[PDB]
Amino acid sequence: ASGLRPQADPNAPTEMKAYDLEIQTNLILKAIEVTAMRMEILGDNRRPFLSVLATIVEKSLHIPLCEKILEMVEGWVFRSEGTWPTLKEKTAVLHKMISFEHRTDPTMLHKFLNLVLRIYEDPKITRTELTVRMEHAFLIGTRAQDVEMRNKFMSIFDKCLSKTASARLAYVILGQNWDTLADSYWLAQASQLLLGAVDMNPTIQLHQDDFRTLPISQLVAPYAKDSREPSVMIDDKFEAFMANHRRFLAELGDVRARDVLEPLMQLQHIDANFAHEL
Amino acid sequence: LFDHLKPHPYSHFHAHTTLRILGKLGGRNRKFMTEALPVTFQQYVDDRASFDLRLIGSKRDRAFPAHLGIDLAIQKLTEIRQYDPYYKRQALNLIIAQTKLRVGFDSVPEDLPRLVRLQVEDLVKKNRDVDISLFEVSDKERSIAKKNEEQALLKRLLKALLYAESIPEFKQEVDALLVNLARHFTLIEIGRSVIDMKKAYTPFDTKSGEGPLFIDNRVLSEAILESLANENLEVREAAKRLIKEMHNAAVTVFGSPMHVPRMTFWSSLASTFCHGCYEEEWFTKQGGALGIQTLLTEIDLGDLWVAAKQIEFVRALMYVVKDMPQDLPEKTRRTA
Amino acid sequence: KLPIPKVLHDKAIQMPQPVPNIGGAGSGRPTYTQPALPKTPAFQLEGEGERVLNKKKLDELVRQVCGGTAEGQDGNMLTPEVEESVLNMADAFVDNVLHQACRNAKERGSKVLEIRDIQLVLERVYNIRIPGYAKVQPNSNWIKKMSAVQAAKV
Amino acid sequence: ANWFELCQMMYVSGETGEPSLETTGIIEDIVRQQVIEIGLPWEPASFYSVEVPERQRLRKADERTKAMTKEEYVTWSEFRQASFTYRKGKRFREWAGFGLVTDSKPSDDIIDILGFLTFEMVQTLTEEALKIKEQEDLHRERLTGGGGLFDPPNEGRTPVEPRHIQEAFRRLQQRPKKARAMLNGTKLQQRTQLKLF
């Protein structure tokens, strides 16, 4: 795919027929399944098994095999009860699984991020050793292109922190590590966190020294004390016209802070210059 | 040329070619300057427009700029992954909110219809017993340049709203909003006509100044002019429908179509469409010709009005014929 | 013209790294004067400071070897006259070890000073072994002489 | 090499934390140096020409064993089997340089003895370094409210450091005064060989 020339090396990578590839993959799946049910007595073989699993997930592009490995890892993390595969060693495989972000196929990445979201919404595992080692995965989730996933991650993030402006600024400045997102403009996430400490319910309006269009009340003020009667009678059509106009006027003055603030925090994620301005 | 000089991850072919060209130029590559250097500046020094916000751990309100994401929103809306509709929806939301903020909120009396009909009665006749003292107070504390900037921004917002009709998902909401705005502006225009009629009948030289400063609601005319000669069809149809809606609202408010052409609005519309015919862009010329055609064959203001405007119309159309380059398509000249 | 290659060699595409200040002119001079990415000078925002740690180092060592100090007393474990002796000892040790090691390193044809020379000097002259930093047999003439002596003895 | 074996041995001895790579490296170099440096013939029955046929560690260990859970007990039992040479003969021989310093292919009893000795060295080093670290912390002992989403629950436990291992090694190299009693009253420097602790 990269077009690199083939060199003369006895162990040089080669290509295999599709039929042989499928046969090999089926054999590998059977071998892994049979080996993984005796995890309590592997002993000296405990580490090579996890090493080969990590290599497979890191390099292979076979969707069924990666899906099976991920399902096994999730089963270890959640439904396991006995002595674990070397306690917090499955975290090594989970960390190796972060490579899905640059694959041009978001299926495996989406499965992994769903698993991470599950891990970080479970009350049993809160402030535990597991949630301290998945910071990189959580940040990668907050950086996701998929809008729904990113919004879910940011919603959890905002739900955890406090709701005071000084506290949120302090957390941004010295409360978080941004080493994981060092190659991207990560101040958009910081701005999104900051905007969570703003009241979004109250109505808004421009100041009194700003410029707007001509109000009708100013135009009808001269007739304040004119107690006259129009020569032409008021008809139903005029009444409906004025009722609709009054409804529109009422709808005019119903702008809240969210109607402006939310679109900006959504739009800052596709343009860096506006993020800088914000 | 200086924009191709970027390090490795950037294409090195372009950068090395540019470096070679500059090296071959030699001493001439730093001697071409004739003027000093361009610099960007603001037209006014007053504070910009803003609204008030509220931080949770505080007791006071703070001002927030009201111009922040308008440029990006318009660019993302009127210039066209599976996530595009999401961002387009966000942009439309922001634009609608900004337009609503710029129009403003008002509280009118209970018996508005009576006052409106009294205004119509005074306009049809030439009553001279109307007090316009509030419209002679001088406003010598604010900036006129800032007002011009706000007017231009509102015109841009209206143009974006009008363009947003070429998307089947957004059509209904923007259409309803535009119709409501047109009716509101007709109501404004009737009162403005009354005030203008009263003003010209008191030729004085007293030391009373002009009126207050406000955003002119006639930006819609310019937006309509710029929308008539659009590539998409729905945009043109909506632009025509807005003119028809304004005329219908005026007819409904007056009671009969007899005295509708006594407003000052229609002369302004005619002047806008006539000046459109003299610009140096062919689509502005086409819009002007189409606007004159719409005023002629779809509203029917009367016969005295046309007899008054015929000379200007003929001059403008003949100029459009005169000034079109002879190697572009012939559609504009045929329209004229 | 100039031969723009279809691909650049690995040296031209490097992702620059921090670099030290070389040249010998000096740094920080406010006069009329550069690498792509210089290295950040060292700094400390707030703390005890070196002037206190260096002075407390000797008391720390004394506490370490003395076995332990009871509550309510510390620091004054050596009289003023013994501290001067200890500091002189340290200076003399450093100077002597370095002087021996440099000459030993130059003896074997090297042009740089490596840890092996210091380790050799420390082990063979002072009986000190610092972990964590990485035979003789008689020849034939001696054997013949011993054989002759043994034959004479019998 | 032998990093994880060292980790298991430290865990068994009482270091439940996660020591860095420097500590493991230093311990490995110490053990390698010792291994490289490395009835009965002298019994009373040897006095004659013709022979004739005949005829605090425990307390702490017990306290810990009483103070462990079932999973902790299983982990402790599994880690107790860590070895340097158990079914690793070729790797151990390569790591210890058998060929370069001795005739190749020694018997297996030698390998078992070497494994036993190495386990003992690691145990002793860990036990001494723990005490040194504890004393240092005890002497040394004598602002972010709110909270985030990744900070540890309680923390408070840290592993040993290279300086502690160095101090333990310095302590373990001292010899009895009997090996120096013959230099009393003189100005002669004591020079010896590496002590096999």
Encoding tokens for residue B63?
A: 């001002």
Experimental technique: cryo-EM
Three-state DSSP state, B65: strand
- DSSP letters spanning A76-108: HHHT--SS-SSSTTHHHHHHHGGGGGGSS-HHH
User: By C-alpha distance, which of A47, A49, A52, A144 is closest to A100?
Assistant: A144
Sign, Cα dihedral of A125, A126, A132, A136: positive
Count of other CB atoms within 10 angstroms of residue B287: 27
C-alpha to C-alpha distance for B51 and B62, rounded to whole angstroms = 8
Alpha helices in D106-183, H assignment, sequence order:
108-141, 162-172
Long-range contacts of residues C7-11, Cβ cutoff 8 Å, at least 24 apart: C8/B8, C8/B12
How many whole angstroms from its chain centre is CA B131?
31
Which residue(s) pair with B102 in the sheet?
none
Largest separation between any pair of C-alpha atoms in chain B: 81
* Whether the Cβ atoms of residue D9 and residue D119 lie closer than 8 Å to each other: yes
Three-state DSSP state, A39: coil
Q: Is A83 within 8 Å of D87 when comparing Cβ atoms? A: no
C-alpha to C-alpha distance for B109 and B107, rounded to whole angstroms = 7
Alpha helices in chain A, H assignment, sequence order:
18-36, 46-59, 63-78, 90-96, 106-120, 129-132, 135-142, 147-160, 165-174, 187-194, 216-220, 236-252, 258-267, 272-277
Distance from CA of D33 to the nearest CA of C (A): 9
Residue of A nearest to D155 (CA): A129
C-alpha to C-alpha distance for A46 and A93, rounded to whole angstroms = 13
**Kind and range of the H or E run holding D23:** helix D21-37
Q: Do chains B and C touch (3 or more CB pairs under 8 A)?
A: yes
Enter the DSSP assignment of B164. Answer: G
Backbone angles phi, psi at D93, to 5 degrees: -65, -40
Q: Is D166 within 8 Å of C63 when comparing Cβ atoms? A: no
Alpha helices in chain B, H assignment, sequence order:
12-25, 70-77, 84-103, 112-124, 144-163, 171-200, 219-228, 233-254, 265-276, 282-297, 304-323, 331-335
The position carrying tokens 């430290």 is D10
C-alpha to C-alpha distance for B220 and B154, rounded to whole angstroms = 9
List the Cα angle A24/A29/A33 in 5-degree steps: 150
Q: Is C8 within 8 Å of B17 when comparing Cβ atoms? A: no
- DSSP letters spanning B30-56: GS---S-------S--SPPPEEEEEBT
Residue of C nearest to B9 (CA): C13
Distance from CA of C1 to the nearest CA of B (A): 8
* Whether the Cβ atoms of residue B315 and residue B327 lie closer than 8 Å to each other: no
Encoding tokens for residue A175?
A: 């409360």
Q: Do chains D and B touch (3 or more CB pairs under 8 A)?
A: no
Three-state DSSP state, A198: strand
Residue of B nearest to C13 (CA): B8
C-alpha to C-alpha distance for B336 and B316, rounded to whole angstroms = 9
Q: How far is CA D157 from CA A135, D13, D15, D26, D127, in A?
A: 21, 16, 10, 21, 16
* Whether the Cβ atoms of residue C61 and residue C89 lie closer than 8 Å to each other: no
Largest separation between any pair of C-alpha atoms in chain C: 95
Three-state DSSP state, D83: coil
Residues of B in contact with C1 (CB under 8 A): 20
C4 touches chain B (CB under 8 A): yes
Q: How far is CA B56 from CA A195, A260, B53, B59, B66, in A?
A: 11, 18, 10, 8, 21
Encoding tokens for residue A70?
A: 């991920």
Q: Is D144 within 8 Å of A174 when comparing Cβ atoms? A: yes
Q: Is D75 within 8 Å of A83 when comparing Cβ atoms? A: yes
Instruction: State the angle between helix axes of D21-37 and D162-172 in degrees (0 to 180), rounded to the nearest 10.
Output: 20
Distance from CA of D164 to the nearest CA of C (A): 12
Encoding tokens for residue B163?
A: 């363009």
C-alpha to C-alpha distance for A167 and A175, rounded to whole angstroms = 9
The position carrying tokens 């170099």 is D29
- Residue D54: exposed, middle, or buried by beta-carbon count in 10 A (0-12, 13-18, 19+)? exposed
Cα dihedral angle (D66, D67, D73, D79), rounded to 10 degrees?
Answer: -100
Of D146, D148, D152, the CB nearest to A176: D148
Enter the DSSP assignment of A42. Answer: -
Encoding tokens for residue B281?
A: 């862009």
* Whether the Cβ atoms of residue D5 and residue D73 lie closer than 8 Å to each other: no
List the Cα angle B245/B247/B251 in 5-degree steps: 115
Three-state DSSP state, A206: strand
Q: Is B76 within 8 Å of A267 when comparing Cβ atoms? A: yes
C-alpha to C-alpha distance for D35 and D28, rounded to whole angstroms = 11
State the best of A110, A210, A239, A259 to mutate against chain B, taking most chain B CBs within 10 Å: A210
C-alpha to C-alpha distance for A113 and A97, rounded to whole angstroms = 10
C-alpha to C-alpha distance for B50 and B62, rounded to whole angstroms = 9
Long-range contacts of residues A86-93, Cβ cutoff 8 Å, at least 24 apart: A86/A46, A86/A47, A86/A50, A87/D75, A88/A129, A88/A130, A88/A133, A89/A50, A90/A50, A91/A130, A91/A133, A91/A134, A92/A50, A92/A54, A93/A50, A93/A53, A93/A54, A93/A57
Three-state DSSP state, C19: strand
* Whether the Cβ atoms of residue D95 and residue D171 lie closer than 8 Å to each other: no
Encoding tokens for residue B130?
A: 């109307």
C-alpha to C-alpha distance for A61 and A107, rounded to whole angstroms = 11
Of C64, C127, C132, the CB nearest to D26: C132
Radius of gyration of chain B (CA): 25
Encoding tokens for residue B288?
A: 């002007």
C-alpha to C-alpha distance for A63 and A107, rounded to whole angstroms = 8
C72 touches chain D (CB under 8 A): no
Count of other CB atoms within 10 angstroms of residue D109: 8
The position carrying tokens 């990093």 is D3
Encoding tokens for residue B217?
A: 């609601």
Residues of C in contact with D165 (CB under 8 A): 132
Task: For chain D, positions 10-69, list CB contacts with chain A under 8 A.
Answer: none
Residue of B nearest to C7 (CA): B12
Count of other CB atoms within 10 angstroms of residue A244: 13
C-alpha to C-alpha distance for D16 and D12, rounded to whole angstroms = 8
C129 touches chain D (CB under 8 A): yes
Q: Is C131 within 8 Å of D192 when comparing Cβ atoms? A: no
In chain B, which residues are followed by a C-to-N distance beyond 2.5 Å, i.e. a gap?
80
Encoding tokens for residue D160?
A: 């040993």
Q: Is B117 within 8 Å of A245 when comparing Cβ atoms? A: no
C117: Cβ–Cβ under 8 A, 6 or more apart, which residues?
C101, C102, C104, C105
Alpha helices in D142-181, H assignment, sequence order:
162-172
Encoding tokens for residue B242?
A: 């807005």
* Whether the Cβ atoms of residue A156 and residue A120 lie closer than 8 Å to each other: yes
C-alpha to C-alpha distance for D48 and B94, rounded to whole angstroms = 109
Three-state DSSP state, B326: coil
Q: Is D144 within 8 Å of A157 when comparing Cβ atoms? A: no
Distance from CA of B179 to the nearest CA of A (A): 11
